[PDB]
Amino acid sequence: IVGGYECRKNSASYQASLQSGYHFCGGSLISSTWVVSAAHCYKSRIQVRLGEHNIAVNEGTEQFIDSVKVIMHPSYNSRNLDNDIMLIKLSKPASLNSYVSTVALPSSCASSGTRCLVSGWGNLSGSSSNYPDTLRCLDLPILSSSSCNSAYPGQITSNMFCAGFMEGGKDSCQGDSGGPVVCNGQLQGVVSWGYGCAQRNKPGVYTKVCNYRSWISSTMSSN
Amino acid sequence: IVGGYECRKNSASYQASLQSGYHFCGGSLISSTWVVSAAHCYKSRIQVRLGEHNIAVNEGTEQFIDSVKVIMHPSYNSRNLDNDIMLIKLSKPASLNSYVSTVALPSSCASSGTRCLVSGWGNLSGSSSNYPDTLRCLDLPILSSSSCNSAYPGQITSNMFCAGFMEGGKDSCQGDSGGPVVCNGQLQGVVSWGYGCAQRNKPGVYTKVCNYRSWISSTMSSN
Amino acid sequence: IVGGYECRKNSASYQASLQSGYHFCGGSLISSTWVVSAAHCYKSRIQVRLGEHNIAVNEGTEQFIDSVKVIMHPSYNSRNLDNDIMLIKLSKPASLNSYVSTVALPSSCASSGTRCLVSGWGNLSGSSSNYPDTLRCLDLPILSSSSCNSAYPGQITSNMFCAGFMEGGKDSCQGDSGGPVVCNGQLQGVVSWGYGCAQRNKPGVYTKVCNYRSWISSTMSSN
Amino acid sequence: IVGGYECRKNSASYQASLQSGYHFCGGSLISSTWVVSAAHCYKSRIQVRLGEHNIAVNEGTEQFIDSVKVIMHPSYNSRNLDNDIMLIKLSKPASLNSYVSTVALPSSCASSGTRCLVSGWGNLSGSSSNYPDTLRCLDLPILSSSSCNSAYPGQITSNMFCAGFMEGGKDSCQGDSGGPVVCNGQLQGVVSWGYGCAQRNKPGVYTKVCNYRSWISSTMSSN
Ligand SMILES: [Ca+2]
């Protein structure tokens, strides 16, 4: 996360890390058995890590659970990262407690100006590799489609929204992919892509989770 | 354009003029070698003029590039103007510069109420014929399907949308056909037809370019 | 390759394809037993295809040779694609002829403005997935370090260079990775990355091969 | 390690933890600047942690050094894990002493019956995700080729050996990968794979390090 702050101990307890083999992505817990992440972080076998804020050391709260099903969106497109969302079913349910909680699915789509929180263990800089051991947090607004489309002309689909700062300086970054953008208790975004990190007029692009409410429901109900 | 203004030197720089001695239609530059226009403006050999917004005062501003391929949509229907879109391949690439730029192809359709810009050297009047040497611009909204269908019952296909003002007064007009309707740096419409110009309850009808993103991409890729 | 042309029969005969699983990358033949490509195209076992022009049909000119060793650069960084170069040793020598030839390694780094040729069977479109059957070629210049750095702020290392057109319209694209940039008969770049394809102010970024001349010699001698 | 014991303080002072935020594989120090691990543990940037048996406590003895080169065996096959060995060059030399020492390379291959020591911070359970903070050790014998091949028909190559107990109960496990099997002061194996952990007739399979004495020696001498 570039220009964010370390999350408080009690914050962001829905946050998951995925060991997609040896690649790292974030994710978020939406029920005791299901995790959502970005489809570009796919691997057929993933270990989900929960209840962690400092990944370098033991805090006693950690839960490591392997996936049993990994379901990429049917129309995920690796060319432009359209429909960059995936669901992971855990082989055993997570034990919810203070450090491991679920985040609610969106009831509706959030509008521009809604303030949200993004979180992750990704890169702290847009010109060098600096990765944190504690989870970082960042408050940011959803930006208008006019802003989003003018920042990335011809690249933004209906399944994407931009969030962050056109002046740059604060953004999600590499390693945050798959992680949650939560607005008023609901999961509205999945960290997906951007050009560089925290550059002016290049805000982050997030998968628009409120477009997938039926798909996520349907998939959980019958898998 | 009826009821517009002279375009600011920087706006509408993606504007092309289709000529064969006379300039008869507009178009827009989507890459250094491709122009999109309206299929009803078809001629087998077209000289494309790029440059200065004033087509009379030349001082080496202009570039005149001949067409090497002109491809109408395969299902263009001249009775109702369905699929009124065409691509023109330039025999040499345009010099992109302060006068000449490209517009991006849409990755999503625009919604009713998005504000857009139309431009052209067409007729300034809904009563007389009076044509400008300086490119005119008009800011206009996309209208809802219900208003469009109310205005032209049984004549709007899914490949058409209405834009403009139901009160009349401001509209594109004859000679503007083939020209760009750009919303948030993206080509959303091609000027196609209407009943008169700037009449009450007869808004301009435009080819809905977002329905052609795959046909445009494939035709450019393969030719 | 976006905006390029079909390579002549006899040109680019140093071009290889790597069927690295279901990943396809380009590569180039530098001796009868060694191929150069991008480290991000790595797979443990690779089938190298040589002498191809049309990859969809049998041509009577192909040599299909399996790798015996695949050696990524020791400091390849998958996070920012620094040192994106790999050497592949063929399990038997290729027979060189009019269709299969080697390219020379660089005696020096090429300067801005040198005209080069990039080739590959990657995507023809920056707005859709359209892959060719026949090998495509594109003539392009090496750009200045300042243009490259302003196109990709904070991301360009000394082991990378940009080549192409700041105007967009012509570029290499997905699937061209690992393929050759040859300037005056010497291999100067390996197709590595870019944001989108053929967009304004986003030229391709290429691995700077002239930085690896001793590594390539030493590796070929020790393996 | 399933069924082992916490290593004595001087035991396994050649043990390395490979980290990328979290511990993900083991390794062993073979000189002040080189570490051997398993190629399936590859990451392009690794932090090597040496000198402390409790992975979660910064108690004192610890050296944390970043990798500068990561070199997988050139013919590593990810499919069957043949030649599952990798060398990591350190950016700074490690200080050797009572808590950090090197392990000798093998001068000949160990035979069946040789008793050896495996170590790691891997999973403690073959049915649960259970990871230790303190380094575990397990004394185990090399098994015959016949036992190895009847346990894993058609999957054992000449570059692999089995070690452990055919009755099960004691084995290395996930997270121990890349770590050392030392016999009579020399590194004979690298933890590579197995079916499950500590299962009956499914002993651990290890990379046969005595087959790579020349490759390790030339690679260290040319990089
Ligand atoms: Ca062929």
Residue C103 amino acid letter: V
C131 is written with which tokens? 């892959």
Contact (CB<8Å) C223/D70? no
CB < 8 Å from B in window 142-171 of A: 145-146, 149-150, 153-158
Cβ atoms B159, B87 nearer than 8 A: no
Active-site position among D40, D53, D67, D73: D40
Give which of A20, A55, A59 to mutate to test D binding, by max D Cβ within 10 Å. Answer: A55
Helices (H), B8-165: 145-151
Q: Which residue has the tokens 């691997």?
A: A43
Binding-site annotation: residue ranges of C for Ca(2+): 52, 54, 57, 62
SS3 state at D200: coil
Q: Does residue B108 sit in the same domain as residue B157?
A: yes
> How far is Cα of residue D95 from the mean position of the Cα atoms in its chain?
21
Cβ atoms B102, C169 nearer than 8 A: yes
Q: Does residue B151 sit in the same domain as residue B222?
A: no
Q: Which residue has the tokens 């062993």?
A: D28
User: What's the rounded Cα separation, in Å, for the pair D165 and D201?
Assistant: 8
Q: Is B52 annotated as a binding residue?
A: yes
Q: Does residue B98 sit in the same domain as residue B198?
A: no
In chain C, what residues touch A154 (CB-CB under 8 Å)?
A: 127, 199
Residues 6+ apart with CB under 8 A from A67: A35, A45, A46, A47, A48, A88, A89, A90, A91
Active-site position among C40, C67, C82, C119: C40
Is D71 an interface residue toward C (CB < 8 Å)?
A: yes
Distance from CA of A222 to the nearest CA of C (A): 31
Phi, psi of B79 (to 5 degrees): -75, -45
Q: Is B62 annotated as a binding residue?
A: yes
In chain D, what residues touch C76 (CB-CB under 8 Å)?
A: 44
Residue B214 Cα, ligand 1 centroid: separation in angstroms? 27
Contact (CB<8Å) C169/B93? yes
User: What's the rounded Cα separation, in Å, for the pair B76 and B69?
Assistant: 17
3-state SS of chain A is: CECCEECCCCCCCCEEEEEECCEEEEEEECCCCEEEECHHHCCCCCEEEECCCECCCCCCCCEEEEEEEEEECCCCECCCCECCCEEEEECCCCCCCCCCCCCECCCCCCCCCCEEEEEECCCCCCCCCCCCCECEEEEEEECCHHHHHHHCCCCCCCCEEEECCCCCCCECCCCCCCCEEEECCEEEEEEEECCCCCECCECEEEEEHHHHHHHHHHHHHCC
Cβ atoms C131, C175 nearer than 8 A: yes
Phi, psi of B148 (to 5 degrees): -65, -45
Strands lying side by side in the sheet with D5-6:
D5-6, D136-141, D115-120, D180-183, D186-193, D204-208, D160-163
Residue C120 Cα, ligand 1 centroid: separation in angstroms? 14
B/A touch flag: 3 or more CB pairs below 8 Å: yes
DSSP strand E in chain D: where? Answer: 5-6, 15-20, 22-31, 34-37, 47-50, 63-72, 86-90, 115-120, 136-141, 160-163, 180-183, 186-193, 204-208
Is A113 an interface residue toward C (CB < 8 Å)?
A: no
Residue C106 Cα, ligand 1 centroid: separation in angstroms? 29
Question: Which of C144, C133, C16, C156 shows the shortest CA–CA distance to C86?
Answer: C16
Distances (CA, A) of B73 to B17, B78, B153: 20, 11, 24
SS3 state at B218: helix
Active-site position among C13, C37, C67, C177: C177
Instruction: Encode B184-207: b = buried (16+ Cβ within 10 Å), e = exposed.
Output: bbbbbbbbbbbeebbbeebbbbbb
Cβ atoms A94, A65 nearer than 8 A: yes
Q: Does residue B127 sit in the same domain as residue B74?
A: no
Domain coverage including residue B5:
1-12+103-210
Residues 6+ apart with CB under 8 A from D98: D10, D13
In chain C, what residues touch B222 (CB-CB under 8 Å)?
A: 124, 130
SS3 state at C143: coil
Q: Does residue D138 sit in the same domain as residue D151?
A: yes
Residues of A belonging to the active site? 40, 84, 177
SS3 state at D116: strand
C179 is written with which tokens? 């393929």
Assign residue D113 the CATH number of its domain: 2.40.10.10
Q: How many CB pairs under 8 A join A and B?
A: 25
Q: Which residue has the tokens 């490979």?
A: D18
Residues 6+ apart with CB under 8 A from D197: D2, D123, D125, D126, D171, D172, D173, D174
Q: Does residue B133 sit in the same domain as residue B75?
A: no
DSSP-derived pairing of the beta strands D47-50 and D34-37:
unpaired
In terms of CA atoms, which chain A residue is nearest residue D23?
A56
In terms of CA atoms, which chain B residue is nearest residue C131?
B221
Contact (CB<8Å) C128/B214? yes
Phi, psi of B142 (to 5 degrees): -70, 130
Q: Does residue C119 sit in the same domain as residue C95?
A: no
Q: Does residue D77 sit in the same domain as residue D116?
A: no
Is C64 an interface residue toward A (CB < 8 Å)?
A: no
Contact (CB<8Å) D129/A24? no
Beta bridge partners of D49: D17, D64
Cβ atoms B22, B9 nearer than 8 A: no
Q: Does residue A126 sit in the same domain as residue A31?
A: no
Total count of domains within chain C:
2
Q: Does residue D27 sit in the same domain as residue D90?
A: yes
Phi, psi of D64 (to 5 degrees): -115, 110
DSSP-derived pairing of the beta strands B63-72 and B5-6:
unpaired
> How far is Cα of residue B99 from the mean position of the Cα atoms in its chain?
18
Q: Does residue B167 sit in the same domain as residue B129?
A: yes
Instruction: Encode B18-50: b = buried (16+ Cβ within 10 Å), e = exposed.
Output: bbeeebbbbbbbbbbbbbbbbbbbbeeebebbb
Q: Does residue D78 sit in the same domain as residue D128?
A: no
Is C214 an interface residue toward D (CB < 8 Å)?
A: no
Is C123 an interface residue toward A (CB < 8 Å)?
A: yes
Is B217 an interface residue toward A (CB < 8 Å)?
A: no
Resolution in A: 1.7
Binding-site annotation: residue ranges of D for Ca(2+): 52, 54, 57, 62
Contact (CB<8Å) A129/C154? no
Cβ atoms B189, B116 nearer than 8 A: yes
Cβ atoms C164, C183 nearer than 8 A: no
Is B185 an interface residue toward A (CB < 8 Å)?
A: yes
Is C77 an interface residue toward D (CB < 8 Å)?
A: yes
Distances (CA, A) of A111 to A143, A149, A154: 8, 15, 21
